[PDB]
């Protein structure tokens, strides 16, 4: 089989920035060479056919180039829509085969989540378990520190989190982390609190209910 | 206004066979070659194989020559993969494809299907529970004000989410689903709003598990203290 490499599997640039994604195959493809945009919600669509002819509806800030066994995907003036992993395809000889994937990234300023938190419902609660969840809404970069604190105590184990991909308008992430509980240990304890840190923040933000005033 | 558009998700056994349909329109069938392509959750694209559907010619990558038949019926213009000996490594999205010709020999795949999420596992479809995600208090200081729906506890994926029958849109994020340690889903999704503009809708989020025919229409109620 033809490997196909996509050397660096993610990238991050300004607006307006020029962008190039690489794709190298293992021995010499003679122009044979397709790219793909996969949309963060998955829809596929072609970008460029052999080598550097544009498909339909593609703006002309999309160019490719390349020979023998290196190419080149260009953007020329990146915009937030351009969010997507672009994947190369050969068809020198079957199997085709694609390279790895290229996810890009805008780069953006800094900004701080708005956190907010949020009891479990009883709907939830008289069937036995409880999640709490928090929510960092809308922050650049994509690293957080998301701490739960059960009556100030830190807990560990008990809690899974998921981001978005970033938003093709504004290119922010957002993050869920939810505290599963017992509705018996959650009826325990008076304060929850969800700890975040974030480079956007003066310093750690602290959002907290006590069950009983809720 | 070239569509392929695939069968919805499938939850079969391992051991068993899946058969799924990618139904064309806007183009001639019979004038186009057919190619299918796999990806596994959070990985690369692999071929699996074409098919010429005037006469039934087909094409396999020689990794799937034990796990795919491409078949077509032209008289409903559809393409089908039928997928046999399922394992947990079958589980992925799949894509039907359009093959263009272009010259003398430059081919690409010029119109991509919206992909089949098949899931192989021995486990039970289970519809979602859907809870309020409604704070406990509002700021007066906070410019925007959020809620959501959690929608626990189902099997397999995919669930969709909409807020107030997709006429809400702005400001909504539905987080990746999670697998919880019992091996059913959860996630949540949450919209946020200006909170000056927070009063003026109400706030349905709208929950669709296909595997289990489970639709949940759940109004979040807006009532919240001030601090």
């Known amino acids: 089989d033809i490997q196909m490499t996509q050397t660096t599997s993610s990238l991050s640039a300004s607006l307006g920035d020029r962008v190039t994604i690489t794709c190298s195959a293992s021995?010499?493809?003679?122009?044979?060479l397709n790219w793909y945009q996969q949309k963060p919600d998955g829809t596929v669509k072609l970008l460029i056919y052999?080598?550097?002819s544009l498909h339909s509806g593609v703006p002309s800030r999309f160019s490719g180039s390349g020979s023998g066994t290196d190419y080149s995907l260009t953007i020329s003036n990146l915009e937030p829509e351009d969010i997507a992993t672009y994947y190369c395809?050969?068809?020198?000889?079957?199997?085709?085969?694609f390279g790895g994937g290229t996810k890009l990234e805008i780069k953006r300023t800094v900004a701080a989540p708005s956190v907010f938190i949020f009891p479990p419902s009883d709907e939830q609660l008289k069937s036995g378990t409880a999640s709490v969840v928090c929510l960092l809404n809308n922050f650049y970069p994509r690293e957080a520190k998301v701490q739960w604190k059960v009556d100030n105590a830190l807990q560990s184990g008990n809690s899974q989190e998921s981001v978005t991909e970033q938003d093709s308008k504004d290119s922010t992430y957002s993050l869920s982390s939810t505290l599963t509980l017992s509705k018996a240990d959650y009826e325990k304890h008076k304060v929850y609190a969800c700890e975040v840190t974030h480079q956007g923040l003066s310093s750690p933000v602290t959002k907290s209910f006590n069950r009983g005033e809720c | 206004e070239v569509q392929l558009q695939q069968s919805g998700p499938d939850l079969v056994k391992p051991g068993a066979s899946v058969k799924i349909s990618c139904k064309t329109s806007?183009?001639?069938?019979?004038?186009?070659?057919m190619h299918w392509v796999k990806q596994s959750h959070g990985k690369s694209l692999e071929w699996i194989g074409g098919?010429?559907?005037?006469?039934?010619?087909?094409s396999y990558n020689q990794k799937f020559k034990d796990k795919a038949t491409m078949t077509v019926d032209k008289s409903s213009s559809t393409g089908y993969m039928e997928l046999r000996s399922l394992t947990s490594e079958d589980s992925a999205v799949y894509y039907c494809?359009?093959?263009?010709?272009?010259?003398?020999?430059?081919?690409?795949?010029?119109?991509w299907g919206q992909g089949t999420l098949v899931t192989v596992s021995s486990a039970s479809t289970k519809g979602p529970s859907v809870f309020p995600l409604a704070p406990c208090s509002r700021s007066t200081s906070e410019s925007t004000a959020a809620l959501g729906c959690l929608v626990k506890d189902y099997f397999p994926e995919p669930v969709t989410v909409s807020w107030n029958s997709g006429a809400l849109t702005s400001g909504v994020h539905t987080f990746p689903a999670v697998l919880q340690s019992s091996g059913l889903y959860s996630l949540s999704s949450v919209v946020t709003v200006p909170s000056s503009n927070f009063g003026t809708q109400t706030y349905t989020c709208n929950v669709d598990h296909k595997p289990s025919n489970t639709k949940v229409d759940k109004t979040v109620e807006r009532k919240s203290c001030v601090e």
């Open positions: 098919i010429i559907p005037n006469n039934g010619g087909t």
């Open positions: 494809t359009r093959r263009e010709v272009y010259g003398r020999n430059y081919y690409a795949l010029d119109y």
């Open positions: 806007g183009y001639t069938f019979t004038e186009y070659i």
């Open positions: 021995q010499g493809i003679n122009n044979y």
């Open positions: 395809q050969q068809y020198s000889n079957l199997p085709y085969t």
């Open positions: 052999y080598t550097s």
